[PDB]
Every structure is written in structure tokens, then in C-alpha cells.
């Protein structure tokens, strides 16, 4: 196919929601390209509304484990875990297209006994704090910045994202 | 998307 | 019309789930029976699987506010808020029939929630409801708070004899 | 019936959600009770989770228009529009039972064109500010307090509601 | 019941949607109150999100035909046909409670089949739209152009904005 | 498949509803066939109940833009946009099988009064456009087609030739 | 097959709704064609009712980023984001077929707290403002013009789209 | 009750759809009001979107059978069978309110070819009966009503008076 | 697969309902077989409960247009349009298997639609279809048109012996 | 009520479907009217689309057993079993209003299990068909072959066609 | 693949219900195997619950027409039309596995309109019932009356009962 | 593919429900493996919750008909007809993995005449299944009538004591 | 409905 | 509605 | 709602 | 609820 | 189905 | 469909 | 199933 | 679509 020809050039796509299946598909391509050449950069193109935090963490840990720099690029949108993975690119190599959209927010879901609800509520808050801390690192900001700015849905243009620290450059016409 | 990615 | 002949004898029934509707019907009868005679006992017959925590609390507060002693009697079963109201009768005047059933447990939810902040808020509210119910029922039973925390962790089914030992009723008719 | 006969003692109930039917039934009883005697207090008993803003406003304006003082008492719970109506009682005559619950929050919703969504969003934000302003009046607090404290679901015990300025007295056994 | 005892004082309620069945109940009561005394005012209390145009016209025309002045009062809300009937009270006797809400807008629908049939129904809807704008302009003493402009989308009004617009005459205060 | 072998004889099929999806396949085959030889006729076999107006128009404009004559043949039926496309074949090269049927009619369908009026106008523009074009295809007066598409108008093969909608019935 | 045979001549299709995958297929072909020759024009054929704004923006940014001119052509219809992508072609190289239809309109939607509804309403208006401004540049008109003319569904003939500035030339 | 007091003044209402049930209640009141006095007029107030043709025909035949003149008045709307019944009032005594709506149209529907022909034939007979009778009401021809009900025909009170379906509009 | 190997022997199948899809699939094979040899017979095996009149009519016209004789064979059943197509084979070459059944009946619709004018239109088209099929199938059977009018009034089940006696087939295979 | 005053004039209605419920309601009224006066005619007004054949037979056998003549009158329509009952009136006393409609057809259902059971129910359905055709031929003084022909499919008749057919006696201006 | 490998040894399967698809696939393989070698027996393995009578009849007539003897063998089960096809094998070459099950019964419908139409189809079903009994009597060398008794309701048979009945010849090892 | 490579080693899988479709796939592979070599064992791996009795009997009769010994092995579970087929392996060659689960039970599922017929047919299946499995387990029939009365869950070791498998494969 | 029923 | 109905 | 309606 | 409501 | 089809 | 289409 | 089928 | 696209 053509997508095979894009992988030939070290381009990996994440299009649509991040699920266990799509996440593991990205992981397989990352490991594969590093197998083919551990010394050339990889280009991770992201147009995603988000999805499973767990699946995204699987992509994240793979991006950081392999030797090659993983450049990230947003086309269309990078929202929630998609924005998370975008900000996780190699610093200096995180890009967005001019009319791309970035959105970040605290975790949201849509249980049983009071003990169980407390357990899952506490787990969700750990996820919230972990995601805020990692993204504070990505953006070179104070953790209080991300706590404040992800409280509700935070929509950003590419320039607002460049200024926030989530990407580095905006690709231009 | 080159230059620069790739 | 049979139910009014029993109300004239100061018998009030709670049959079925504790809802805002059934709860307020009991409150009106409690207020009615007090106005007719603030000096004679009221007899609150309970055959209920439980229901709304708040709706039951409106019954509870009325039972404690009025001048008459509210005697409680369990027939069939008294579960969750049904058991709570049974244990809330005047001490010395909480009764059960020989094959009645009592069950107590911590609160539970059918669903829930959207954002991590919101789920955190409702987790706390539900844990507050849990601790309140254990504290109050520890007082009703003349038992330690630690006992009730242990004994509502999961569904706790009791015979009339197990309920009398526990402090939840006074005698079996 | 018996709700009849509590109405004979100038007690009006609001049980369950606030709807156009619940409201105009309450408004009618208020007009009737004022007709029977415009100079004796009326007692508005509230056990409600909330409902329609416009229907609650119809009770509210009726409570303020009639000559008799409208005392409010919360039994079970008064949440959202129900808590708004509770706070609207004559100051000094707003009551709660010991295990009552109060909850307040900003407006909530369960549009087509962007122009139409813009319009309905203004109407929703106008409603939010109006409700926050009026309750700041009811509670003798700053608008900023109500703005801060209705941001998410805010559950209050009877003692917290009295501190807040939302009720005047907790009734005791 | 209590609603019966409100009818003894010449108050008629419209609560909830305007339907053929709610409309004719109101119409009958208006004829009844006129039958009991053609010379005393009638008091039309409105809390409605709107409803059927034709059912609303049936109430409207009765208000205008009978001898008694029909005073109108908004509590809660008067939207779409509810606001129309609100504005239709005897001028000087249209009231709203302080936190009442008014909304007015052009007709809405949710259509059928052949292009001929759709042109017929669109043309009828525009006639309905134009009639409602003309009549509302008269009730408010404004230009048709105002109501054409101001009903293009949902127009929510506080009680003071409705008095400014000409839809009511006075806000009833605490 | 055999359908490719029909394409090598320059046969293009439209079977079933006219959709964006079926339409663009027809459009693509027409462009390919012009590419293969812009001077040889194309034969468009149509068995269709109608469908999307815009999708049919994309086929229509392609028939008129490419150099080769596009002959049309109705087998089974050509109704609504299918009859429209049938009537759009090269004059003199529109055919029907003896027991095929043709049907033509005005446009059909399945907010705010302003929105309904806008769509009512667009629907009437489409109606008038289709009536004018079909009058050109059939060499008739616009008044004929306005009257004759007011409701569903079923025509036999002999009636379709008499109307000007096809030119010849295949007899063997 | 035929669609890849069209790709050899640097023709890319968008048929049907604009979704993340129909969009990323187009973006992949655009990057591929630039890769094959960064100096020849590309021809983007559009028959679409619209779809995801973000999905369309990815195509849009790709069209403007690559070196080759992207010519656009409407067949059948180009509505909403389909009309957006049509107008985004290289000026001088935006075409429509004679019976093509163009439609433009403001964004529309089919939720939680008032704070949350405010954030999404404001974002919807920014998207509305961004689309109107970008399309105003495509037509050499003003943002205020596009706000007036997208307020409700605006259907345009091919001839009206050329007068408006969304296409340059009608092919006949 | 309010409705009993209106019936005492010889007012009969038809509000909402025309069904066998709503039709027979009107038919019962007509026979009753004639029973109470065969020499005073009856006043038929109509606010209806239409309904069953057969059910409406039972009202129509009852209106024409009894001695009292049945005046008709449209408030709100009288559509389809509701308009048919409106036009059937005593000529000179068919009224509408200023903002009333009248609508008339041909019949509407929502097996074997033989069975389909039969029901088509019966539907066209019903269409022809309704057009003919209403032409008689309006003092126009069958061809007139065939043209004017071919698709939905919405009419104001003045258009309905001009058409012959009502006599007078009440101030 | 096996069906292509049957096509090499000029056998075309129609199995199941007659649809626009199954019909054009059959039509393509008839045109293909004529292209490969216009002078050898084609063998049309039919096991079908019926289906669309226009789709069947598309197959019918192709059988009559091509040069090769189209022999038909019924196995299982040939009902409605399936029976029509069976009877449409070359006279002398229409066959049935011993326990095959043939069924004929007048047209029928699932379920009707719009205004009375439109229903008149579709009833009229339906009766035209009904009459054309009776006329054509009488010609296939060499019978009076009146016979087919009577005998398709309702579902008419026929054994193979009965179909041969009726004129719908020529010969039962053993 | 209104229907009460019509019954005292010995008018009975059948409005709507013929069901066990509507049929026995008719049968009860027929017995009651005969009870009050066994010598005055009864007037059976029919507006019905048809219904259960068995329920219709219970009305029919009641009409024929009681002492009074049961006149029938069709207003609106009398279809299927409704037309059967209309034709069943006392001969000379079966009427229709000018624009009444009569419809007659052979039986219809909407079978089954084993072929033996289908045979049994098919045979039972044809006996019902023939019984209704035979009985109605007597009502109309026609041959059974006439009714078999004319109920083969739905047979819609004007009042004038029904009187010409023998199904009613006379049409009331 | 594997089912294609059984076909080279002249094995044809009927697995599952008898439908127009499975039937003509079986017919196609029968015609195919005959063309390849019209002189070798064919082995028709049947594991089927029954199904369409006309579809089974096309298989049956194909079995009787082709030159090869068609042996039938039951594995799993042969019920209704499946049993019919099993018994239709070449006499002397009809087999079952030791724990195979055979069932025979009269025709059955799951779930019409006018009495004329119901009668026609009932008559058609009884013709099918009679045809099936006669052919199966010939297959089993029994009197028609035996099969009429024995297909009246579901008739389950062991492999031994099936050979004793005449429905198979031979039970394998 | 991977399952093809396992068949080359004379391994056939039965995973999931026993249906007419899966049963005939196993039967075909059994016939194929014997024709490839009638003198080498076949290894039948079972992870199944059960299913159709007749479809399982189809596999069973094939296992007993072909010349090669059919070894059976339970991984995951062998329940209902799956347990029947497990117990049906060549004796001395029926295996289970350490944490497999075995379950055995009675069969489980108109006019009274028809219901009697099917009740009688179901009872025959119950008695046959008990008798055959008692033979497979070298136990007395009364044990199986007692022990399949309700769902009987067995560890690999309880299954080995029961006579249902021969060896548990160690680590 | 009289005359004649009743 | 009088005058004149009634 | 008096004064003044009624 | 007295005293004091009522 | 030969003889004779084919 | 020849002659003549094609 | 051999012998004997096949 | 040539000339001119392409
Ligand atoms: C950005 O310009 C990347 C382009 C990739 C081209 C490779 C074609 C598969
Ligand atoms: C026919 O004219 C019958 C009238 C009956 C009147 C009884 C009163 C309801
Ligand atoms: C028209 O003005 C009719 C009035 C009816 C009055 C009677 C009230 C019950
Ligand atoms: C406005 O003040 C109306 C009051 C009406 C009182 C009557 C009570 C039923
Ligand atoms: C609070 O104590 C209210 C008591 C109400 C008494 C009235 C009895 C129906
Ligand atoms: C009738 O005997 C037809 C036989 C066809 C044989 C071809 C096999 C693929
Ligand atoms: C009309 O006669 C067309 C015939 C096509 C022949 C070639 C089929 C592949
Ligand atoms: C009965 O023994 C069948 C054997 C079949 C062998 C062929 C395997 C592909
Ligand atoms: C416009 O004329 C495009 C033509 C493309 C031809 C390529 C053939 C597949």
C-alpha cells in the first residue's frame, strides 16, 4: 500500500482514537523502525481525539525507551492522550500544522459499593496528578500551571500550543 | 512534511 | 380503607422501597398521629428492601423530632435503609417477628460521574454518607464504630435472633 | 386526604423534582393559603433534588409576592433548584432537620447551528449569574463566594448550610 | 379542588404546552367567565414553553371576541406561542413576575414528500411566520421590521426587557 | 472478472441506486475509457430506480465532457435519475430492451421556517433544472415536462421512444 | 485498479463524507504525489457533503504545505468542508462541472456544566470565525461577507460559485 | 362541569382528531339536543386536524338528518374532514374566527394487484364523493374541488369565505 | 471454483431471489457465453422463489436478444418471476426435474403509499405489469390469455407433470 | 350520561371493533332492554370495522333469540362482521344513513405448526367462511354462489348498493 | 484446504440446514464429481437438522439423475430433510455411524392472509406431506400407511432402529 | 499458518463451543490425518465449554472409527460434550494440564404429545451419555447417575481419580 | 334517527 | 361566540 | 396576584 | 415540625 | 443434466 | 446488445 | 469412512 | 477532466 511506503520513510501514523489495538500497532512500528536503523529519527504523525490513557502510556513508554528520536507532528487535532503523545516528542522536534487544534483536560469517565467507588476515584486522581506532572515536564512549566489549565477542556491553536510549551515549531506554507 | 519532518 | 383502620390504632406501614414518595407519606402520618395524641406511642411496621438514603433520613429525623415514642416492628424483612429505620425506633420498643430478616451494608450506587474532580466530590459525599450511617447505627446498637465498619463492609444478613444480639432490635414477638 | 389536612395547618410540600406541574401546584396552594389568611406564616416543606429553573422561579416570585411569610424547612434533601427555594424563605424562618442535606451547583444541561448554540449558551450563563447573585443575597455573602462555591456540586450538611447563610436554624429532637 | 376555587375569582391557567386540548379548556373557561359576568376582567396566568400555532390562535381569537378584558400574567416563562398569548392581553393589563422569562422566535418544525408539496408547506409556514410577526408587532407597537429581525433566532428576554419591547406593561414587585 | 471483459468492449454498467459511490465508479470508468481511446463510442447499460441527484449529475457532466459518444441502453428499468441519465445519451444512440420500463418524476424527499424555505427553494431549483434538461434531451417544450413529471410517470419502451427519451428499441 | 490508475496521473479523489480516514488517505496520497514529483500540479476531485472540520483541516494544511499546486475540481457537489477544500485549491486552478452544486454554511452540532458548555460554544464560534476568515481569503472577499452568507444553508450553482470566488472556471 | 354547561346552550365541540369515538360522542349530542328541542339551532364548534372519513360521514349524515339547523364555527383550525364538516353547516350559519385556518386535500394513505386495484378504486370513489359533496357545499363544480384539493390547500378565514366553505367571519 | 467450471460448459445458474444484482450477474454471463460462441446453446438452471419484475424482465430480454438458444431447467422450484423465466426458454428445451415444483401468480407488493392520485398511478402500473405477464406467459405456454388470467389469480402450485401439461415446460428429465 | 339516555330509548351502540368485550356489552344491553319490555323494538346502531367472528356470533344469536325485533342502522361504516350484524337486523328494519359505507369480504387471519394442525385450522377457517357466506345469502335472499363471488375480495358498497344487494332495506334521508 | 481434499476422494458434505445455498453447492459438487469420473461411487456425508423441502428436492433429483451411485452416510444427525436425503442413497450403500441419530416427521411451518390463500397453501403443504411419505415408503420398502403413522409427530431413531426401519443399510464399526 | 503447522504434527484443536460447524472440521482433520498415515497417533487438544450432543457424537464416532489412537488433552477446560470427548481418548493417552478444569453434567436444554416425545428423547440422551462415560471412566453407572445430576466441576487430579483422564502433564 | 328507527 | 353563534 | 391582577 | 415550623 | 441439457 | 449497442 | 464408504 | 485538469 501507500501507508507501507510511508513507513519505508520512517513515518508512523496515529489516526482516530487511541485504543489498545491502535496503540499496540504504533508500538510495533516503533520497535520495527528501530530494528531497521536505531540511529535515524522516526516521525510520529498524530491526528487523534484521545482515548485510553493506558494505551497511550504504552506508546509513551515506547517512545522514551527506543534509541531514535521520535519527532511528533499534529495534523487536524491532538486532544487528550493525543495531545499528551504530541507533547512527548523529542524536544525541538515537536511540530504542528498551522490550523491544527490542541486540547488538554483532566481525566473524565462516563460503579458499585462505596469502598469500590473510593478506590476508583482515588485511582482516577492519581492518573490526573501523573498526567499533569508529566505534561508540566513536557511544557517546561510549573505543575500548578497544568493543574489550573486542564481543570476543564482547554482548546489551543498551534501558536497558543507553541507558546505553552507543548510543541516547538509550526510548519508553514 | 519536509523540511524538517522528514 | 383497611389501612386507615390501622392508622386509627396508630400503626404506620412502610412496605416496599424507600423513595421520596413513600418516605413523605410516612412523615405525613407521623405528623398526623402526633397531632391527634402527642402522648401515645406510634407503631411503625416495616417490610422494606431499602431505598434512598435521603428519603429515609427524612423519616428518621421525624421519628426523633416528635414527642411520641415511635416503636418499630419488622415483618418480612428490613434491609439497608429499612434496617436503619428499624434500629432507630425507641430503645426497648424495636421488635421483629420470628422469621423476619434484617440486612445492613455500606452504601452503593447503581451507575457514574464525569470529570475526575466531580467523581472525587461524589466519592467524598458517599463516604461521608457511609461514615454517618455507621456512626448512627453504632449508637442505635450500643456498639463500637469499629464493629459497624466491619459489619457493613459487604451485605450482612441477620435473623431476628442475630439482630437482637447485635443491638438492632429489642425482642422477638 | 392527609396532605389536605397538613394544608389545613398552612403546610405546603414540595416532594421530588421541580417541574411545571410541581411548581404550579405549589403556587396554587400559596395563593389559596394567602386567600384564607394573608397574615399567618406559611410553611414550605422541601424534599427535592432540583429541576426546572423557570418552574422554581414561579414558586420563588410567588413566595416573595404574597403577604404571608414563607418559612422553609428542608427534610431529606434540598438540591439545586430545591436548595435555591430553601434559601428563599423568610430570613429567620428557614429551617433544616438534623440529618438533612443541601447541595448547590451552577446550571446543568443534559443545539444545532453555532449561532443557536451561542444564544442558548448566553441564556445559560445569564441564568448562572442570576442564580449566583440571588443566592448571595439569600446567604448575605459576596457574589464571588457563590461563584467559587457553585463551580462544582457542593454538598452541605445542615450545620454547613447554616454557616453558609443558607438556613437559619437546625431543629433538634 | 383549589383550581376550581381559582376559577371563582376569574383566573384561568395555561401551564405547560399549548395543545388543542389545553387550548379548548382555556377557551371554554373564557366563555364561562364571560357568561357569569360580561363586565369584569378575566385573569389569564401563563407558564408555557409554547406549542401549536392553531391551538394558540383559538385562545387568541376568544380573548379578542369576548366583552371582558383579558389580563395576562407570566410566571415562570412564556415562550413562543406562550409569549404570543402573553403579549395579546388587554394593553395596560399584561404583567410579569420579577424573574419571569420571555422567549419569541419564528416558526419551527421538528418534512414530507414531493417538491410541489414541500413548496406548499414552506409557503404556509412563511405565511404563519409573517402573520405571527405582524400580530406581535401590533401587540408591541413596533415595526414589522423589528419583529422580523428579532424573531430570526431564539430571543430570550427578562421581564424588564419584555416591558421595554412592548410585550408586557408592568412587572409586579415584592 | 467478466465485468472487466465487458469493460474491454467499452461497456459501463449502472445497476441499482445512484449513489456517490456507484456514481464515481461510473465516472472513473468513463474517464479510463476515454483515455484508452477518445474516438470510440462508450455503451452505458442502465438498470436503476434512481438515487442521488448530485451523484447522477456527476455522471451526466462526465458523459458530456468526454470526447467519445456515450450510448445508453435501458435493461429492466430506468427510473428518476436513472431515466435522466438514460435520456442523456448521444441522440440517436439511446436504446431500450423490449420489456424495459422508464419512469420520470419531479424531485422527492425522504428546522426553522427560514431553513425550510431555503431547502424548498433548492428543491424547486433542482425540479426546474431537471425539467429543463429533460426537455432538451427529449426535444420537447418545458411545459410538457412540467406537466408530465408532476407525479410518477411510467412509460413502456414504445412510449419512451415516442416521448423523445430514447431513440430505438432493440428487437431480435 | 482504476482509482490507482487515476493516481498515476496525479488525480486524488475525495468521495463522500470527510472523516479522519478519508482525510488521512487523501493526505497520504498528497504526500506520495509530492514525493513522486514535487514540481507537477496535483488534481483533487471532490464530490463530498462535508464532515469533520479537523479531518478537513489536515487535508487543507497538507494542500498548502506541499510544493505542488493542488488544483481542485467539484463534480456532483462540494458542500460544507467539501466546499471549504474546493475553495482551497490553487487560485486559477479551481474548477467545477456545469451541473455541480456548492453549499456553504456555518458549523452545526447534534453538554455538561454551564462552564463546560461555555468552553465548547466559544470553541465552536472560533471554528466558525476561522472557517469564514479562511474562506474569505480564498474568495478575495471579507470575513463579514462569509458570516452573512454562511448564516444559513447557501446553495450555489457552478456559475454562482465562480461569481462568489470559490472556483475559477467552469469546465464544459 | 364546564362542558355540560356549554351543551345546555346547545354547543357541541369537536376538538382534535376525528375518530369513531369522537364522532359518535358528537352524534350522540346531536340526537340529544334535537331530543331536548327540535326547533332551536345547534352550534358545532370545530378545532380539528381531520381524521377518519367514515367517522366524519357519521357526523355529516346526523347533521343533515335532524330538524335543527346545525351552525358550524371554526376556531383554531378545520382541516381535511374537519373542513368537510365545517362546510356542511347550515348555509348562512357557517362561521370562522379571524385567525382560523381551513385546509382541504384529497384522501391520504400511510397485497395482490387485484386487492391493490380494489382499494385504489375505493379511495378514488371516496375522493370523488368528498369533492362532490364539498362542491355542493360551496356551490361550485366537482372539477373545482378536484383541482383545489389535488395538493394541500391552506386557506385563511377570508379565503374560505370566498371559496364558499364558510359564510361569515366573526369580528 | 466449481461454478466457473460449470460456466465453461455454458451453464448459468439463478439460485434464490431475482434481484437487480442476481439479474445483472446472469445477464453478464449470457452476454459472455454468446461472445465465446454465438452458435452453441446456453443452459439456464433455475432454483428461485421469484423476485423483482423489472430485474427478471432484464434477464428475459437478454435471453430473447442473443443468438444462442437459451434452454431452461427447473430444479427445486421456479416460482413467480422464476417461473416466468423458466417458461421463457427456447421451446423444446425447457426442462424440469421430476420433483420440481412450478408456481405462478399475479403481481404482489409488500406494502401502499402517498396521495390517492399516486396510488391510482401505482395501481395502474401494477395492473399493466399484471396484464403484460399474463399475455407473455400465455404466449410461452401457447394458451388463451383468458386461461392465464384465471390461473394466476392466486398462487398456483404445479407439479412438473402439471407444468408440462400447462405449457410452461417441454419435458421432465429422468 | 349521554349514552345512558340513548339506552332508555332502546338504542344500543356498537362503535369500533367487534371484540369479546364489546360484543358481550352489546349482548348484556339486549337482554336488559328485553327485560324492561319484551314487546318494543330495539335499535342497534352500528359503526364498526369488523373484528372477531366468534364475538360477532354471540351478538347475532342474541339478536335472533330475544323476543323484540332488533332493527339495525349503519352510520359511518359497517365492515366485515359489522356488515354481517347490520344485515342481521329484522327484515324490513335494516337501515343505513346516506353516506354510510358497507364492506363485506371473506375471512382473514394474520398459521401455523404441523401440517395436520394447519389442515385442521385451514378447514376450520373455510367452515367459518362458508357459514358467514351462507347466512348472509339468506339475509340478502341471494344464492351462496353470489356471496362467494362477492366476498372473494373486499367489496365496498355505498348504501344504495347495499339496499340493492339485499343487505339493508331502506336508506334514511 | 481440507474440505477440498475430501472432495478429491469423492466425498461431498451436507453440514447444517438444507437451504438453497447449501443445496445447490451440493448439487454443483455432484455434477462436478460425475464429470470427472461418472463410474465411481459418490459418498454423501450428512450431518443436518433438516431445512427447505424444495432445496432438498433439488439435491434428491440430482442424486437420482447422475450416473454414479450416491452412497449416503449419517454422522452426527440426520433429521427431517436430512433424513430424507440419507434414506435416498443407493440401496445397499446407506450408512450411519454407531451413535448417529435419525428423525423423520411431517412438514412443518413456522409462520397467512385470506382463507382462499390459506387453503391453497394448506393444500400445497399436504401435497408435500403426502409426496414425502410415499417417496420415503419406497426408500424404506414399506407401506405408505406405515410412514403416515410414523411421521405424524417427531420420530427419533437410533442407528439400529433406522436400519431396522429400512432407512439405512449398514452401521459402521 | 500456525494452525496448519500444528496439523502437520497430527494435532487437531477443538476450541470453544461444539457446533455442527466446528465438529465437522475436527472430523475432517481426523479423516485427513489417518489417510496421511494410519499408524501414527493423533493428538486432540480440547478447550471447550460444550455444545451440541449430536455434533459431539460425530467427532466421537470418528475417534473410534479411525485406526490411529486418538490421544486427548485438556487445556483450559473440558466441559459437557467437551468433557465427554476428553474422556473418550485412547485409554492410557488421555491427558490434562495442571490447572485445567473438567465439568460433567446431565444434558440441559408445543402440544403435550410433542413435549412427551422430546422429554423421552432427552432422557435417552441422558442415559446414553451416563452409560458411555461410565465405560470411559471404568466406573459403575450409579456413580455417573449421581455425579452428573448437577454441574460437577473437577480439577485435573479429581478427573484423574475419577477415571476420566489418565495423566496430568507435569512441569 | 326517527322516523322510523325509532 | 354570540352574536350570532349563539 | 392582587394588586392588581386581580 | 412545631415548635416553631409551625 | 446431460442428456440433453447439456 | 449488438447490433448496434455495440 | 473406509471400508466401505469409501 | 482534460484540458485543463489535467
Ligand atoms: C513530508 O513532507 C513527508 C513526505 C513523505 C513522503 C513519502 C511518500 C510515502
Ligand atoms: C333518532 O333520531 C334518535 C334520537 C334519540 C334521542 C335520545 C336522546 C339522547
Ligand atoms: C359564544 O359567545 C358562546 C358562549 C357560551 C356561553 C356559555 C358558557 C357556559
Ligand atoms: C393573586 O393574588 C391571586 C390570588 C387568588 C387567591 C384565591 C385562592 C384560591
Ligand atoms: C410539625 O410538627 C407539624 C405537624 C403537623 C400536624 C398536622 C397534622 C396533619
Ligand atoms: C448435467 O449433467 C450437467 C453437468 C455439468 C458438468 C460440469 C461440472 C463442473
Ligand atoms: C451486446 O450484444 C453486448 C455483448 C458483449 C459481449 C462481450 C461480453 C464479455
Ligand atoms: C473415511 O474413511 C474417509 C476418509 C477420507 C480420506 C481423505 C482425507 C483427505
Ligand atoms: C480528466 O480528463 C482526467 C482523465 C484521467 C484519465 C486517466 C485514465 C484512468
Amino acid at each position: 500500500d501507500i501507508y507501507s511506503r510511508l513507513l519505508k520513510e520512517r513515518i508512523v501514523f496515529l489516526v482516530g482514537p487511541v485504543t489498545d489495538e491502535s496503540a499496540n500497532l504504533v508500538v510495533a512500528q516503533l520497535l520495527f523502525l528501530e530494528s531497521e536503523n536505531p540511529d535515524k529519527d522516526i516521525f510520529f504523525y498524530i491526528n487523534s481525539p484521545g482515548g485510553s490513557v493506558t494505551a497511550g502510556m504504552s506508546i509513551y513508554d515506547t517512545m522514551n525507551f527506543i534509541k531514535p528520536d521520535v519527532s511528533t507532528l499534529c495534523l487536524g487535532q491532538a486532544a487528550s492522550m493525543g495531545a499528551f503523545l504530541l507533547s512527548a516528542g523529542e524536544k525541538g522536534k515537536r511540530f504542528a500544522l498551522p490550523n491544527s487544534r490542541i486540547m488538554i483536560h483532566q481525566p473524565l469517565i462516563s460503579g458499585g459499593q462505596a469502598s469500590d467507588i473510593e478506590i476508583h476515584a482515588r485511582e482516577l486522581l492519581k492518573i490526573k496528578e501523573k498526567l499533569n506532572r508529566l505534561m508540566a515536564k513536557h511544557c517546561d512549566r510549573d505543575l500548578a500551571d497544568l493543574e489550573r489549565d486542564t481543570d476543564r477542556d482547554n482548546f489551543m491553536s498551534a501558536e497558543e500550543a507553541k507558546e505553552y510549551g507543548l510543541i516547538d515549531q509550526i510548519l508553514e506554507n | 512534511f519536509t523540511p524538517x519532518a522528514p
Side-chain angles (χ1 to χ4, degrees), chain A, chain B:
Chain A
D1 211 9
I2 278 176
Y3 280 134
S4 183
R5 161 77 175 274
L6 282 157
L7 189 63
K8 291 260 174 99
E9 302 292 325
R10 308 178 71 72
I11 303 171
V12 202
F13 269 115
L14 166 66
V15 180
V18 46
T19 65
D20 284 357
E21 309 85 276
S22 63
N24 206 253
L25 207 43
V26 167
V27 169
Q29 300 174 66
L30 290 180
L31 298 175
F32 169 72
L33 284 179
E34 176 183 43
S35 163
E36 290 279 313
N37 188 329
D39 298 308
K40 290 190 90 186
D41 288 1
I42 292 167
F43 304 95
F44 187 16
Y45 291 3
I46 300 168
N47 181 17
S48 168
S52 163
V53 50
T54 279
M57 277 320 165
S58 158
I59 296 167
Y60 183 66
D61 284 346
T62 304
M63 305 182 18
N64 302 326
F65 183 92
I66 66 178
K67 186 174 174 196
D69 287 1
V70 178
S71 179
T72 51
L73 168 65
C74 174
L75 75 165
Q77 75 180 347
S80 267
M81 286 295 326
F84 184 81
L85 293 172
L86 177 68
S87 70
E90 183 72 38
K91 291 182 171 189
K93 311 186 173 178
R94 305 166 302 177
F95 310 108
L97 293 189
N99 288 282
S100 295
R101 184 176 78 163
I102 286 84
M103 192 254 297
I104 62 174
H105 64 189
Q106 65 170 305
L108 77 150
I109 81 183
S110 39
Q113 281 185 300
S115 296
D116 306 318
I117 293 289
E118 176 185 12
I119 279 176
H120 282 259
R122 172 152 36 80
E123 173 61 10
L124 196 58
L125 296 172
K126 288 189 242 210
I127 289 157
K128 173 176 176 179
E129 182 187 337
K130 177 181 261 173
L131 284 168
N132 276 342
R133 293 186 162 266
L134 286 182
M135 277 201 27
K137 300 234 188 99
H138 295 174
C139 299
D140 306 287
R141 297 183 158 270
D142 292 341
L143 173 63
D145 281 354
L146 275 297
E147 287 175 347
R148 214 181 31 171
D149 298 335
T150 63
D151 181 62
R152 307 183 173 273
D153 287 350
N154 199 333
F155 285 103
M156 283 179 219
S157 67
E159 271 286 328
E160 289 170 325
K162 215 191 66 165
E163 294 294 101
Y164 200 77
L166 294 158
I167 56 165
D168 304 306
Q169 295 231 329
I170 308 182
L171 303 193
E172 272 292 7
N173 298 359
Chain B
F1 287 95
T2 305

